[PDB]
């Protein structure tokens, strides 16, 4: 995340740091973000798995504020580290268009919730695409500068405005590459935006208005990071509720949707 601020410990307890584990030396590197749905499942981006497709390629890190690049040590209470049981990539995912950039990871053993770890909410079946105008938030340990050499050790957060898909898809913006299952967010002039390392993480808007946030988007792609008229392109979670329910059960979906 470029141009944002350090998140407070506990600010986004559903954040998960998805880390590549280099098995030759037991080191781990934050690569992508994800959002915790329940003790056994988190939501993230399919494209994060294009190269590391094996459950053994990853460690999953929960309740973190800071993550340590390259560490070979396990985490400390209250953080939790878990293995991946299964990676479920949408059957219609296409890397060339980034269409249906969404996946599920099954966590093992099950995570335990508490002060720094907890599920996010998904949109209601009735919600539809998120509406402009709104000010929403993203979070993640992605690059702090387009050209950074490493992800950010401290979790970042930033407010970003939703951008209407027609504007986002227009001639001098993404000019045809935006799909109806996308959401775009950021600012016409850029300067604030998600970047590499934040993929898979949430785009969250505050219901209306409980005091609870909804993950309405999943960080997917952009051209560069923080460039003018090249905002963050996200996968709309609402577009995949049936798909998610089909992998984890309607009951698990209903449990993380706010009261009718």
């Amino acid at each position: 995340i470029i141009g944002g601020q350090d998140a407070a410990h506990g600010a986004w307890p559903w954040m998960v740091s998805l880390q590549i584990f280099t098995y030759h030396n037991n080191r781990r590197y934050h690569v992508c973000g994800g959002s915790l749905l329940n003790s056994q499942w988190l939501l993230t981006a399919a494209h994060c798995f294009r190269i590391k497709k094996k459950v053994t390629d990853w460690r999953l890190i929960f309740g973190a504020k800071e993550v340590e690049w390259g560490t070979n040590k396990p985490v400390k209470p209250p953080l939790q580290e878990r293995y991946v049981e299964k990676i479920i990539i949408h059957e219609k995912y296409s890397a060339s268009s980034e269409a249906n950039d969404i996946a599920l990871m099954k966590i093992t053993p099950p995570v335990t919730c508490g002060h720094f770890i907890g599920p996010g909410c998904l949109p209601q079946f009735r919600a539809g695409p998120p509406r402009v105008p709104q000010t929403c938030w993203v979070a993640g340990w992605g690059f702090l500068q387009e050209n950074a050499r490493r992800t950010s050790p401290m979790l970042q957060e930033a407010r970003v405005d939703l951008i209407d898909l027609g504007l986002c898809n227009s001639t001098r913006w993404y000019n045809g590459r935006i799909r109806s299952t996308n959401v775009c967010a950021g600012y016409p002039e850029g300067k604030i935006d998600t970047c590499q390392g934040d993929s898979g993480g949430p785009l969250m808007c505050k219901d209306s208005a409980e005091n609870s946030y909804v993950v309405v988007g999943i960080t997917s792609w952009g051209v560069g990071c923080a460039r003018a008229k090249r905002p963050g392109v996200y996968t709309s979670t609402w577009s995949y509720l049936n798909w998610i329910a089909s992998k984890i059960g309607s009951t698990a979906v209903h449990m993380i949707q706010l009261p009718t």
Partner: peptide
């Protein structure tokens, strides 16, 4: 079953 309950809540610590 610690993960059931009210979704989307921040700062569960307080």
């Amino acid at each position: 079953t610690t993960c059931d309950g009210p979704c989307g809540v921040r700062f569960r610590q307080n």
